[PDB]
């Protein structure tokens, strides 16, 4: 688990603790406790309908960028566990989920 | 000391036309001594002509350049997008080496 | 073909800078640049014309320098051959600029003699400030 | 729309079998895979395995192959039994439906794609505890 | 492939030319051909090897 924390209308930019060796494709979800998993962003930056245009996510475009999702305007409630299940081309299956980031939000 | 000067030091011409840019020294040239250098922001410098009408390797026959004693012309047939730059004048024949100043094209 | 200077350098006022200038990013290369042409290098800063600082030789790497520049300024080549170095001391903030190697037959080639910076090389940024 | 609402005893004496079971409501088994979910406290979330409809049974290789994992359409629901179990082994158990998508980055005749797994409609989870006690 | 040189010294003044890392995926190397523009050119080729058989 990593912690992070970030003060309210500030934009919260949670970073992949795995770094991608080939072309990958990224799911971000979000795991407040005692609540479901929320499916956040698919394919790197898709949003499912019923998810906030607040989440993006990095497109693989150009290789060398890292996968971080964003999230402008961090309400109360946006204070989950964040995974990035992080799928690429040279790892092959992704049975992990990766370590979690534990967003907090200030004040 | 001899000082170069670039007579107007911005020029505006648009796409196909012919361009003059002149370099006066101070005295008298070797004229094997005058180069022109294609100066870009974010880009390589180039040699365009040296000894005052040779064409560099890479260099198109839209340029040429003439000139003798303390006049020298580089001269651009047909302006290219490519060629809207800083063009300067250098001399050598004793250090320090001195530039010319500089003539910046822009387009109309 | 091309020349491949070091990176941009944020500096002190009173300190020095050292760049390099190679031919080839081959660490283990055999060029054979540095040895048979000169090594010019040339300073641009914001709003001037290019300023000449020095010459290097390729006969024993004896430098030519402006006399501006003379007190304060040392060009070296590498004693593998293969790259060529300058150092500026004593840094101002009008030292702040683009520096340049360029590379010169300088008079010296035994059909023609003439003088050109042929290939000149990327540009290594350098900022004085405190 | 698909609802799922998961099922389970949550009192399992150990070493023996644990089964949580998973019934989907709102329509069939059209279009998806089927996963589930464990998540112990003190570590994060954990993918142990799916299936989908020609019943290829893939398990996480980080947990022994110790599970089954099966499913019906007859009752239209899903199934999990892990056997031989610790009580290091208590959890949230998630039932997940996963989708599908495919990666392309060259050549799709020389097989240059990957799959990758969005789970992208979950559940609450079974408190399943483990304890002889 | 983004293919990576890596220069090894193996001797005095030696140096021998590895390959160091693949910088994004490894995929393979192939060859296009058009397809309509191949079988033009082929029935052409065919047309003038009917002459002799
Ligand atoms: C010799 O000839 C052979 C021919 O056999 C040549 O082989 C070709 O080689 C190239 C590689 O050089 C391969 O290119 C990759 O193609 C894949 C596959 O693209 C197809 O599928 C895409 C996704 O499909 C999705 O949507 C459709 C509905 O549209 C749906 O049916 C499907 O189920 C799925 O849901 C389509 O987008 C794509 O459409 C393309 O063509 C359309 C019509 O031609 C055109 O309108 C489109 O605009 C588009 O151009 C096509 O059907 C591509 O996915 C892939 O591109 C991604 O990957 C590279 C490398 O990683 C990356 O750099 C690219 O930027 C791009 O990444 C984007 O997409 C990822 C997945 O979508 C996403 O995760 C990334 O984040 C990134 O997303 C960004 O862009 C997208 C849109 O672009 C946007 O939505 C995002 O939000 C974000 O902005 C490669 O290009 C060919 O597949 C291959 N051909 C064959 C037949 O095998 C060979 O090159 C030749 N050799 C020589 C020497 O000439
Ligand atoms: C050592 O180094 C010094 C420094 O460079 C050398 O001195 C220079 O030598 C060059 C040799 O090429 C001299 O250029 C020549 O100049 C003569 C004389 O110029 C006068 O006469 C011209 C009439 O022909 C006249 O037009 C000139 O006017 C121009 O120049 C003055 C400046 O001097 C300028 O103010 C004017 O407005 C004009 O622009 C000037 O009055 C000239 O006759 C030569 O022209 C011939 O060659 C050219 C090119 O080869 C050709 O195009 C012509 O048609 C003509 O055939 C040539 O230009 C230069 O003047 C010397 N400068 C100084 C300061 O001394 C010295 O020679 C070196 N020594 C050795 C031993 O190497
Ligand atoms: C072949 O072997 C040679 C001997 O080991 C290598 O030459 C030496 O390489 C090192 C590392 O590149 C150099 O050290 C650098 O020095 C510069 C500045 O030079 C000044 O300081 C050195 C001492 O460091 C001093 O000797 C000089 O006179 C200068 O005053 C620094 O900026 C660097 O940080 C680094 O410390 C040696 O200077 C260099 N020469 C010698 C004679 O030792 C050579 O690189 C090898 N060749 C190849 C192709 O690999
Ligand atoms: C194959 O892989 C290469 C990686 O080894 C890719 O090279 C990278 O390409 C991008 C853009 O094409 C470069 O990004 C530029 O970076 C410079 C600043 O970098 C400078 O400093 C580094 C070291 O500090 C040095 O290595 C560079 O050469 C530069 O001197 C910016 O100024 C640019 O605006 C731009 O952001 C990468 O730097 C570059 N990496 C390397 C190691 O060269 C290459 O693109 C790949 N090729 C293909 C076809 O995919
Ligand atoms: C081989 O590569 C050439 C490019 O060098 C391709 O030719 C281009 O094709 C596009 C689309 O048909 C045109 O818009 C361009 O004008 C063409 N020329 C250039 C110079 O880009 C060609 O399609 C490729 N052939 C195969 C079989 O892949
Ligand atoms: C090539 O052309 C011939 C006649 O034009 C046709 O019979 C044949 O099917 C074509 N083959 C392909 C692969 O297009």
């Known amino acids: 688990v990593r912690p992070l924390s970030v003060a309210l209308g500030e934009t919260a930019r949670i970073s992949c603790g795995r770094q991608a060796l080939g072309s990958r494709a990224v799911q971000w979800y979000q795991h407040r406790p005692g609540q479901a998993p929320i499916l956040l962003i698919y394919n790197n930056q898709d949003r499912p309908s019923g998810i906030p245009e607040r989440f993006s996510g990095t497109p693989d475009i150009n290789f060398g960028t890292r996968a971080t999702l964003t999230i402008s305007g961090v309400e109360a409630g946006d204070e989950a566990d964040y995974y990035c299940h992080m799928w690429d081309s040279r790892s092959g299956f992704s049975w992990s989920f990766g370590g979690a980031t534990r967003l907090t939000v200030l004040g | 000391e001899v000082v170069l000067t670039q007579s107007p030091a911005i020029l505006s011409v648009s796409p196909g036309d012919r361009v003059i840019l002149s370099c006066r020294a101070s005295q008298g040239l070797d004229s094997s001594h005058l180069a022109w250098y294609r100066f870009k922001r974010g880009q390589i410098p180039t040699l365009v002509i040296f000894g005052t009408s040779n064409r560099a390797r890479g260099t198109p026959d839209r340029f040429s350049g003439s000139g003798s004693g303390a006049d020298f012309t580089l001269t651009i047939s047909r302006v290219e997008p490519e060629d809207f730059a800083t063009y300067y004048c250098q001399r050598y024949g004793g250090t320090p080496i001195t530039f010319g100043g500089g003539t910046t094209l822009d387009k109309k | 073909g091309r020349l491949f200077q070091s990176g941009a350098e944020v500096k002190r006022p009173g300190a020095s800078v050292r760049i390099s200038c190679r031919a080839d990013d081959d660490p283990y290369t055999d060029d054979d640049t540095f040895t048979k042409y000169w090594t010019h290098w040339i300073r641009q800063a914001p709003g001037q014309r290019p300023e000449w600082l020095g010459v290097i030789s390729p006969h024993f790497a004896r430098p030519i320098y402006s006399y501006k520049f003379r007190d304060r300024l040392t060009l070296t080549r590498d004693s593998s051959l293969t790259a060529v170095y300058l150092e500026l001391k004593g840094l101002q903030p009008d030292d702040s600029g683009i520096y340049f190697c360029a590379r010169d037959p300088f008079g010296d080639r035994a059909p023609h003699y003439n003088y050109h910076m042929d290939v000149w090389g990327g540009g290594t940024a350098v900022i004085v400030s405190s | 729309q698909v609802q799922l609402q998961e099922s389970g005893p949550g009192l399992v004496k150990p070493s023996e079998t644990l089964s949580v079971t998973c019934s989907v409501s709102?329509?069939?088994?059209?279009?998806?895979?089927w996963t589930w979910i464990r998540q112990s406290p003190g570590k994060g979330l954990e993918w142990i395995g799916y299936?989908?409809?020609?019943?290829?049974?893939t398990y996480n290789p980080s947990l022994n192959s110790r599970v089954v994992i099966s499913r019906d359409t007859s009752k239209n629901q899903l199934s999990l039994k892990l056997n031989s179990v610790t009580p290091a082994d208590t959890a949230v158990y998630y039932c997940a439906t996963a989708r599908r998508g495919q990666r392309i980055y060259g050549v799709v005749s020389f097989g240059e794609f990957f799959y990758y797994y969005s789970m992208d409609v979950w559940g609450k989870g079974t408190t399943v505890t483990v304890s002889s006690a | 492939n983004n293919n990576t040189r890596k220069s090894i010294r193996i001797g005095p003044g030696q140096a021998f030319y590895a390959t160091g890392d693949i910088i994004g995926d490894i995929r393979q190397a192939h060859c296009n051909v058009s397809k309509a523009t191949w079988n033009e050119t082929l029935g052409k080729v065919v047309k003038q090897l009917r002459k002799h058989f």
């Open positions: 709102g329509d069939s088994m059209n279009n998806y895979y």
């Open positions: 299936i989908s409809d020609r019943e290829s049974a």
